[PDB]
Design a protein around this ligand. Structure first.
Ligand code: HEM
Length: 82
């Protein structure tokens, strides 16, 4: 099965308690990853609640980073909002 979230609900997860962001139509909950991210937590918080695909690709993440990111997927962006 697959959980679909709307942009409206993803937008609410941008506070000290929860940080979600979208990458290639997939929703990631990075709340517990903020302090471990080699690129820092500031760059993640800034994109919280929205689509960070372009910024993510612009830096050119390694294969290992992409493989690791899959563990944080909680669902996908609702088809109607794409
Ligand atoms: C999906 C979660 C993400 C994971 C698992 C992740 C993982 C990593 C890892 C392992 C690195 C080290 C270099 C590499 O392996 O490519 C890195 C660097 C970096 N990441 Fe992420 N990242 C994620 C999301 C993001 C996002 C959304 C942004 C931008 C808004 C971001 C910005 C950066 C930057 C600026 C660096 C520093 C590159 C440098 O040293 O020049 N990351 N990330």
């Amino acid at each position: 099965a697959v959980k679909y979230y709307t942009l409206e609900e993803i937008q609410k997860h941008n506070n000290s308690k929860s940080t979600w962001l979208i990458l290639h139509y997939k929703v990631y909950d990075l709340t517990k990853y903020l302090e471990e991210h080699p690129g820092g937590e500031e760059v993640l918080r800034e994109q919280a609640g929205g689509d960070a695909t372009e910024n993510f690709e612009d830096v050119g993440h390694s294969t290992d980073a992409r493989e690791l990111s899959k563990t944080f997927i909680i669902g996908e962006l609702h088809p109607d909002d794409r």
